[PDB]
Amino acid sequence: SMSSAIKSYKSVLRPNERKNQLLKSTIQCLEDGSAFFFKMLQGLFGGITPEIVRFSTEQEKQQQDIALWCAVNWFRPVSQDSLTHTIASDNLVEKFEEYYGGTASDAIKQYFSASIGESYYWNDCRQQYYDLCRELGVEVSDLTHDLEILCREKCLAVATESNQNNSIISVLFGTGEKEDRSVKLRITKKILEAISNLKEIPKNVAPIQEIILNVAKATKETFRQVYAGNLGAPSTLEKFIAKDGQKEFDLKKLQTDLKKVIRGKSKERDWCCQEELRSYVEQNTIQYDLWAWGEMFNKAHTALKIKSTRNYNFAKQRLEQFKEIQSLNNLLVVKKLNDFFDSEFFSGEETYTICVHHLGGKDLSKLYKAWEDDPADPENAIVVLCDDLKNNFKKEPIRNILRYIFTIRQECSAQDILAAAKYNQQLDRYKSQKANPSVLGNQGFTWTNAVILPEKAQRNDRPNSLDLRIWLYLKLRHPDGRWKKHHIPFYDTRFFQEIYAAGNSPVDTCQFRTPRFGYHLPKLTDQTAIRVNKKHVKAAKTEARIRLAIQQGTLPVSNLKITEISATINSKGQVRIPVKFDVGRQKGTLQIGDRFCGYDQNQTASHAYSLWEVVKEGQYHKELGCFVRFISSGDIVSITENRGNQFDQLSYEGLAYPQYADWRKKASKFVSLWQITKKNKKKEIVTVEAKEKFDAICKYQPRLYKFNKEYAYLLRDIVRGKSLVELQQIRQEIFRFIEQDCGVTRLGSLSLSTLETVKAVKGIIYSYFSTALNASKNNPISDEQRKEFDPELFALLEKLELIRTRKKKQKVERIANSLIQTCLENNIKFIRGEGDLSTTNNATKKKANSRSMDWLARGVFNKIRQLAPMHNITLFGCGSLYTSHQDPLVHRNPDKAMKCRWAAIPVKDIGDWVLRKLSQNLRAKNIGTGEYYHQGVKEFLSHYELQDLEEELLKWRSDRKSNIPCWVLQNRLAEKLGNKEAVVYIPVRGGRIYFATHKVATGAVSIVFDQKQVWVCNADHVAAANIALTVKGI
RNA sequence: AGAAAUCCGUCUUUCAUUGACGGAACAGAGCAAGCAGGGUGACAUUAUU
DNA sequence: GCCGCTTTCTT
DNA sequence: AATAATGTCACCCTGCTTGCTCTGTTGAAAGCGGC
DNA sequence: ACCT
Ligand SMILES: [Mg+2]
Ligand SMILES: [Mg+2]
Ligand SMILES: [Mg+2]
């Protein structure tokens, strides 16, 4: 079938005063009718029955909890604006049972027992339904009968059966002739009859078309008139009659569609309360208008259905969580675990929830073993495990909690202790968990056929200024209630460029006139002569280029064949323009010649991509079950130029050290004048001269943006113990750093490091405000106070955060663009990406969590997911586990194959940290990836013939005076490699080098290491290859 | 149908009226975390009496 | 053919 | 032993800040009468 | 496990 995607444009409307008033009144009208339908539909959904739900969910393959669907429609947490019949949560269960005829299910119990925010209140929508029946002056059974018709006609969304657009307005309040349903039902039933018992199932549809025409007593030219009275969109049966006749016949499918029609049309639409309901709606809104009532209904109905569905799923989830909690609730082990706070191993003012990560997690087991194996030295076992654990990502255990656990290890096993910690976390999260309130929301309203078509646009073009206006033609409601259409303009140079400007190209047709869709605008020259206001130049430039393209006759004509464009408008005048377009036919599974890629997301280094082809002959891959060939690997990059020099906006690290001496000098003059205040001995004040820290920062010659982050921290430290006078002087320095020369307000790339730098600068200003206003636990400060004290610098807080927000949005867009453009250029139809990456969690260090917040792994994946189907490129998510260590084309071909990662360190640069890592890795044989790094250390010693060192290398702990020095390893390696500048391969986690069996990374070179031929590859390119080769779902 | 308008943004000790460039959007609810001060509380290294 | 309205469509 | 420097780790608070998921929307396709 |  033909796949499609959606692009869109967003601007603000510019109506004159009179039309602005009309638009304001029309939107207010639509909004008030929306609130009315919201309350009325809340009432009507309060009125559904178990048997309506049963009928709507009946063909569902998984059985639905009908009682729970009833519940999520009968009782809703709601806002004060729709609260009509307050119910205490106490009574929820009881009242539900009264309505349901039986005991409330456990999932329903979880839904009722869940928390709600303070501005929300439980509302009994079934009582609201009864009172609505009274207001309408109809019997309850009558309105319920009409509700059954509505839910059968798909006019309302019930459970898993979605609504049929806005059809409710036409079906219930429409003024026109309707279908002859009995005719369609008879014809459909006999057609299913006739095709039920065929003694020869034809391969083509011609005999079946014969049968249908004979039953319907019509010809191919009269079937529509006979069957549907020439009314409505063509049915499946009409289009079956329309088919060629040599086309193949799917008997199963025709029977399925005919059964659908018999099921949906067996009961007629005989309303009981139609005219009451129409009078009610019209009195509470405006005189009947299909479009306007449709918009009101759409807003209200969407708002209600999304929350009912979410609460259904949430209640099921909550029941599962509750059963998991009550399962591992070992009363005694939990109680003694928490008795840690009531024991003298804790002297804190307050307690806190004990979690798995506070215990070391699984490794608590190991610790118990130590205690079994060497009692009466428990402190050393604790210290050894803690040192072995320490990870730059995971949060370290609480030493006293482990100390107290030793006390009770005879009574409480390791597994029961970790079960108890898991129970603590799960119960806490279960208790704060909140049900979802039904609220109208602030969605806008859509006018259909609102944009004047580009080829019909009124254009007041000048020789040097194209008419840049796009006009909507909208029906608006006047004070007398009359609807009239008015022209309202808006500007969008991107919508102008991509679609709306009048193309004149003799030979070119494209979908969107922008580079990623294959079109580039002409270059501006010395003849361009742009003379506009300063605040329009960029827009002017785009206009100029389009003008040039029209003058050259090279502006492509849009091939989208747009016949109507709709516009969605809100109360603030903003307009949204959706454009749907076809992207090609749906792809089949991998053929030979199909190309696919994978991408690896990195933080400090570039995202990597790896490009592969399915081949007829070549290297076989089991998991793909095909032959594959490596095309190429690379770094994801987004270059822009400054007078010929290139910059990767994604990775640029700013000026090298020697190139910003002046800037550094200025910072230097400041720090020589100041000192850091510190008072954590007693209340006595300790002074250190800031230059000490500044020299330390400048010692290892960082590049510009790292330097700026480090200097931001320094400034914050300088600001900490000062007085107001001092702060006034310091305020002058803070402004110079932020605003001039190399400050984040003029320089900084889209790199993660730059975002962290801007965050550190915000930290400076935050510390300024905290110290100035004497902040404390008993004296919290607010934004009101901060703004009153120093409005300008408080404004800089928001400005810096907006800078970060804009950087991050632009960055996500640019990463997706670079990868998609790589795919288009290398004819890639499939992308694999890690859909698995961590966001943030209590078990992770706050520094790593903050970095991950600025990393935006999920956002990047979502953006690639958004852009890929716009070029018929499929994106698959895959689990990220072990993708950095698998050996490409060897792992799962046929067996599991993994290796450590390596770094290329010059021998002179081999410091005590290398020994730390080497020692740790060697004495680190364990489950998971440690085994591969222990193996890598083994191979390292073998290759460099340093095995004699292994022994003492294993006794290496940090700070031991009898540790082997760096000069030892450096001198052996320089003995063997000849000099001090030759590289040494070291196994280190996160290293950028992978020793691959195969040449699976562009630019790899083969060496022999530990008597093994192996390709020295970029580790992230290896990871991208691993991701590309994965087939398993996430 | 009313000549005005950066649609929204990015890079650069380069800030550009011919510099180089990028983007489907929107609503509500929910969840997860971060920071600046301030408190608590454990450990570890130095360097001494 | 267009506009503005109706209806049904099982995608 | 014991004091005090400097660093690590964690746990809490007030009042702000952020990213991510969920469940949805931005209709399709035909005829009619009046232009 | 990703992430260094
Ligand atoms: Mg990865
Ligand atoms: Mg700038
Ligand atoms: Mg990687």
Numbering used by the authors: 0 to 1033
What do the paper's sentences say?
The Cas12i2 consists of the recognition (REC) and nuclease (NUC) lobes connected by the wedge (WED) domain. The RuvC domain is the sole DNase catalytic domain in Cas12i2, with catalytic residues Asp599, Glu833, and Asp1019 lining the active pocket.
In addition, the ssDNA bound in the catalytic pocket remains intact may due to the high concentration of the complex and the chemicals used for crystallization, suggesting that our DNA-bound Cas12i2 complex is in the substrate binding state. The phosphate group between the 2nd and the 3rd nucleotides is located in the catalytic pocket, indicating that this is the cleavage position. Both metal ions coordinate the scissile phosphate group and RuvC domain catalytic residues. Mg2+A coordinates the side chains of Asp599, Asp1019, and Asn601, while Mg2+B coordinates with the side chains of Glu833 and Asp599. Mg2+B coordinates the 3′ oxygen atom leaving group, indicating the cleavage products contain 5′-phosphate and 3′-OH groups. However, no metal ions were observed in these AacCas12b structures. Our Cas12i2wt–crRNA–DNA ternary complex with two metal ions bound in the RuvC catalytic pocket represents a substrate binding state of the catalytic pocket.
